[PDB]
Structure 1
Amino acid sequence: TVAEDFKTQNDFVKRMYDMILLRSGNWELETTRNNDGLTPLQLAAKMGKAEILKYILSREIKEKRLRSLSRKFTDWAYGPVSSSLYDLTNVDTTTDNSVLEITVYNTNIDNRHEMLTLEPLHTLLHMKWKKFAKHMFFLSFCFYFFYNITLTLVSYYRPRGWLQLLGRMFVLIWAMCISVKEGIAIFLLSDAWFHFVFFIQAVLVILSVFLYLFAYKEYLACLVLAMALGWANMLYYTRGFQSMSMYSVMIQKVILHDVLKFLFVYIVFLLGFGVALASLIEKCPNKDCSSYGSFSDAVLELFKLTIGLGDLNIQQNSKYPILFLFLLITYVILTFVLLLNMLIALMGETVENVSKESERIWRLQRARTILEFEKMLPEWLRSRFRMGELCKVAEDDFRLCLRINEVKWTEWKTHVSFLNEDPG
């Protein structure tokens, strides 16, 4: 509980941990749980104590009589090569609250970008991934892409059972099941709003098709909005590979961080300059003789001017043409300045930490997806996957383990401890 971080403590608490642990030599201390139902390992997992965690997960005790207390046994070393045999007793998500499911599902610590790089956690995520999660995730991407192309074709070929029944029933069933899935996912408590938006798009599709079946011709709006939103939601599934991961997540960073506040201030610009210009206008005796007519007209022209399609004509039937021209030049200049300010905000600030934030968000979303798929599978298939092996380390321990080969040329040591004398 009191272990904070090396920069503020010099990490004596890890030393005292080792001392007190191997002094009372047994699993008495690590096995008890507190009134929150957590063990010291699970506890350091619940909080964000990375140092204590990195110690407990990979703790090697090389003394003979206390070797059974370790959670990493170099069992195979021959030279600069070696095969550390980590432990997966309460880390492998096969318990109520594992260290891994805690480290991934605890979003109120804000340090996981480091904790999910620890000794067995990182490679266990990697192994679960390459075993089943890559396959299930790519399958989900393919199903969603086909559902999206079917929404697109249904939208294009709206009525101005070949095209109607097949596609409409398929989108109905897919949308209803994914909506129930996302909704029950909401009921658990830029990280996980994709549940919100997926559920919203699915309900949009289902409402659109139900209204199409019903006596309401206002279904096309819902349908086309659902299509544009599903194509937006493809952003979730383009988190996968390194290029698309970085691309999608920095697009998200732009969209949410900066362009939104830029849009807010620009809409304030629009409101103010629109009311000003429409207040400067004079009614034409040929009212269409000046495009800045009603308020909404002026706002439209100002929009087009920002994008570069409006027209600058000094004869807007003004009463003070110089002042009106001044206000209009002011608006275009200031929105130009807001464009420049946005450019600097996204070209100087994020560019430093974009590489790191992209990677940490990629990693956290991969952890969440892997652990979610892990639940989506039945007990028998999960036991059929069962990352890790068996390994004898004590008189009779035979606790699960996870081999990790390694190579280190720096620290040469006469090997003294191993499980197998002969390297396999």
Structure 2
Amino acid sequence: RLKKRIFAAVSEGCVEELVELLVELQELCRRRVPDFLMHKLTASDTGKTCLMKALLNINPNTKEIVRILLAFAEENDILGRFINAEYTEEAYEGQTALNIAIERRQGDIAALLIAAGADVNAHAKGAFFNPKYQHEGFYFGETPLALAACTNQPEIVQLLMEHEQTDITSRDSRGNNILHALVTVAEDFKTQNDFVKRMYDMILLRSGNWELETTRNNDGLTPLQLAAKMGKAEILKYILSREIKEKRLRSLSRKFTDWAYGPVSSSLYDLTNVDTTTDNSVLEITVYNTNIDNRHEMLTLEPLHTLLHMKWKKFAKHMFFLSFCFYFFYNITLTLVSYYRGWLQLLGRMFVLIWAMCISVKEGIAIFLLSDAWFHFVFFIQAVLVILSVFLYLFAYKEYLACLVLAMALGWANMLYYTRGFQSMGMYSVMIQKVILHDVLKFLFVYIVFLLGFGVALASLIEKCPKDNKDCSSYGSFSDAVLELFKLTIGLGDLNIQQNSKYPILFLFLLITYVILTFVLLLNMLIALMGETVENVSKESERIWRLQRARTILEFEKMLPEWLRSRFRMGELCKVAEDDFRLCLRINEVKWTEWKTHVSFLNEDPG
């Protein structure tokens, strides 16, 4: 009766008169108190106050309505519990009248509420504000400041931060602070037009500290490492190279100019959580993280590219070549053992069993942590076949030679893995690897279905009795027919009018259709398709090879001793600020495009 007229009165707002009148009837009816007016003025089912329902509906009279509501609530001194009230429902739990004014982009009302004692620190944790299966829901973070930031409202953000009571470092129920929230949101430039990077900068520069960017959510990740886990490149380039020009806050930069003279300048990068001296770093994640498929542009960024390059030039090259030698001698000895079947067996065969066992154990351990790893299966299968053939050679059996030669041939098929150390051959083997996947398999399927079709097609016609002459009937059971067709593809097969085939015309037609469907159609189709894929792969092949090479590099790094690993330690100590000493990576640059007087720099004397 009374409440519904109020809720409808503010929802409409076309009449502020009967809002004043109905409110007057409420105050006069209040003579029966603070809790009473809250219960009668607040919807009991959802916990929705009329102020909420008034903000949800934006009409030109809404501001005055809010003023009237706040004055009426202050006159009875319910203003404290009136603004800070919030939904009790499971889905909307925590939402406050400030989240609504910020979500609906109302700057004036948000200011009035803040100045009126609204809680700026209120976390909204519902099922709708912390969605799983993100299609239906929105996760901006819990805090209001994260909402004004994620919705691209620079004015309201500055209001909240300038407010003395706001807590910038607040961590929501998931563990995320505001920077984590900005990272879990940001998508790409073609989508958001990159307003998140701006807000990230704004908030950092607004609160000077490493406190925000050094924290960890409940998954144990800094907002940098989180941007590495997720696929976000545009925010990672920013975070990963920051140049702060203002001399006060310059200590927050991750990139510095050591010296600059004319166009030539030597900048300096910060490797702390990058360079893989920590547990899980930015470089280990962007490489080993298989849930992204953005990793092309991930490893082309500034410090990562030259980290990989410098590691390769230091150690990983020589370990890779050395591995190539030890595998090459192994496979040669394997061939010489396989080909000749006194002291040669005693000398070599022992080493074959030894290094085969080593490959089996190492590749087996690596395959226990599980299309990138496909080699680990193949080398393992080889080693299994070798040591198995050794067991069947010691034991008395005739099947040992099969496994031996199959392991040998498989090994020479595994020479391919070592073509990723060279640029010219690496991209080549990448393009092969993609052709097999996208093109050839489709061919082999539709071709095998034809072999199986025409096999039973022809065997049934030639099925007549040979009359004890194996040369009269050229086609025996289904095997001989398929084998004969595969001969015909090479040009070995014998095409003639066949005796014992009661239907020589139908036979010949049905064979010619096989030749046509194979050669002039389905085999050339493959060539056209490959010609289509090479054009698209030729662009990304270099990046793909850079990725594979990178994973090899990190593997060799993880196989080193703790001391020899610390022997290299790419980077150098450099003094950034008074107390700041941090391992840095130097990269020299020459830029003719934009000229300026160099003010912020590290050393005066270029070296």
Mark yes or no: TM-score above 0.5: yes
Secondary structure, aligned partner of 1:390: strand
Query: Unpaired segments of 5 or more residues in structure 1?
Result: none
Normalising by structure 1, what TM-score? 0.97
Partner of residue 423, structure 2 = 242
Shift of 1:140: 0.6
CA deviation after TM superposition for structure 1 residue 171, in Å: 0.8
1:258–1:342 contact (8 Å) kept in structure 2: no
Going from structure 1 to structure 2, the CA distance change for 1:316 and 1:352 (only over 3 Å counts) comes to farther
**Are the aligned partners of 2:464 and 2:501 in contact in 1 as well (CA < 8 Å)?**
no
Paired position in structure 2 for 1:228: 409
TM-superposed CA distance for 1:346, in Å, is 3.9
Q: Tell me if the contact between 1:22 and 1:66 (Cα under 8 Å) persists in the aligned partners.
A: yes
Query: Matched residues in 1 for 2:342 and 2:265: separation?
Result: 64
The range that moved more, 236-245 or 335-344, is 335-344
Q: What secondary structure, in the 3-state scheme, does the structure 1 residue paired with 2:245 have?
A: coil
Report the CA distance between 1:209 and its aligned residue. Answer: 1.1
2: CA distance, partners of 1:8 / 1:316: 71
Displacement after TM superposition at 1:316 (Å): 4.3
Given that residues 211 and 218 in structure 1 are in contact (C-alpha distance below 8 angstroms), is that contact kept between their aligned partners in structure 2? yes
Name which one, 1 or 2, has greater alpha-carbon Rg. Answer: 2
Q: Distance in 1 between matches of 2:378 and 2:534?
A: 28
2:572 is paired with a residue whose SS is coil
Query: Could you tell which deviates more after superposition, 21-30 or 346-355?
Result: 346-355
What is the percent sequence identity of the aligned residues?
100
Contact persistence 1:84–1:403 (CA under 8 A): yes
Contact kept, 8 Å, 1:74 with 1:417, in 2: the verdict is: yes
Provide Cα deviations, 1:71-121, integer angstroms capped at 9, x if missing partner: 000121101100010110110101011000011110110011101000100
Q: What whole-Å deviation, never above 9, does each CA across 1:298-325 have from its counterpart, x for those lacking one?
A: 1111000012110110224221211111
Q: Deviations over 1:306-360 (max 9, x none)?
A: 1211011022422121111110001111111454344334433212122233212
Of the structure 1 ranges 280-289 and 309-318, higher mean CA displacement relative to structure 2 is found in 280-289
Matched residue, 2:348: 167
Contact 2:243–2:256 under 8 Å retained in 1:
yes
Contact map agreement 1:179 1:202 (CA 8 A) in 2: yes
CA RMSD, Structure 1 to Structure 2 (Å): 1.3
In structure 2, distance between residues paired with 1:110 and 1:46? 11
Deviates more, 1:331-340 or 1:179-188: 331-340
Mean CA deviation greater in 209-218 or 390-399? 209-218
Give the TM-score of the pair, scaled to structure 2: 0.68
Asked if the contact 1:75–1:417 (Cα under 8 Å) also holds between the matched residues in 2, the reply is no
Check whether the contact 1:113–1:364 (CA below 8 A) recurs between aligned residues: yes
- Contact 2:439/2:530, CA 8 A, preserved across alignment: no
Contact conserved, 2:430 with 2:544, CA < 8 A, in 1?
yes
2:539 aligned residue = 356
Give the match's secondary structure for 2:259.
coil
Q: Could you tell me how far 1:238 is from its partner in structure 2?
A: 1.2
Q: Measure, in 2, the Cα distance between the counterparts of 1:343 and 1:13.
A: 46
Q: Give, in whole Å, the separation in 2 of the partners of 1:272 and 1:162.
A: 54
Between the aligned partners of 1:342 and 1:127, the Cα distance in structure 2 is 44
d(CA) in 2 for partners of 1:243 and 1:342? Answer: 28
Query: Contact conserved, 1:259 with 1:342, CA < 8 A, in 2?
Result: no
Q: Take 1:348 and 1:237, find their aligned partners in 2: how far apart are those partners?
A: 26
Deviations 1:224-276 (A, max 9, x none): 00001111111111122122112222222222332222112111111110101
Give the direction of change, closer, same or farther, for the CA distance of 1:415–1:321 in structure 2 (3 Å limit).
same
User: Is 1:409 matched with 2:592?
Assistant: yes
**For the Cα contact (< 8 Å) 1:258–1:345, is it kept in 2?**
no
Tell whether the 8 Å contact from 1:262 to 1:338 is kept in structure 2 after alignment. Answer: no
Contact 1:168 1:209 in 2 (8 A): no
Is residue 2:516 matched to residue 1:333? yes
Deviation at 1:287, TM superposition (A): 4.2
- d(CA) in 1 for partners of 2:342 and 2:361? 27
220 and 357 in structure 1: CA distance in 2 versus 1, 3 angstrom threshold: farther
- How has the CA–CA distance of structure 1 residues 134 and 346 changed in structure 2, closer, same or farther, with 3 Å as cutoff? farther
Structure 2: tracts of 5 or more residues without a match: 1-183
Pick which of 282-291 and 197-206 moved more.
282-291
Residue aligning to 1:324: 507
Aligned-residue offset at 1:132: 0.3
Runs of 4+ in 1 over 6 A off after TM superposition: none
**Alpha-carbon deviations, 1:107-151, whole Å to 9, x = none?**
110011101000100100000111000010111111111111111
Alpha-carbon distance in structure 2 between the residues aligned to 1:246 and 1:121: 20
Moved more, 254-263 or 337-346: 337-346
Distance 1:208 1:156, change over 3 A: same
Q: Whose relative contact order is higher, 1 or 2, with alpha carbons under 8 Å and at least 6 apart?
A: 1
Per mean C-alpha deviation after superposition, the further-off stretch among 245-254 and 183-192 is: 245-254
| Alpha carbons 1:282, 1:319 under 8 Å: kept | no
Matched length: 422
What residue is the counterpart of 1:109 in the other structure? 292
Report the counterpart of residue 14 of structure 1 in structure 2: 197
CA distance in 2, matches of 1:313, 1:186: 53
Q: Give the structure 2 partner of residue 190 of structure 1.
A: 371
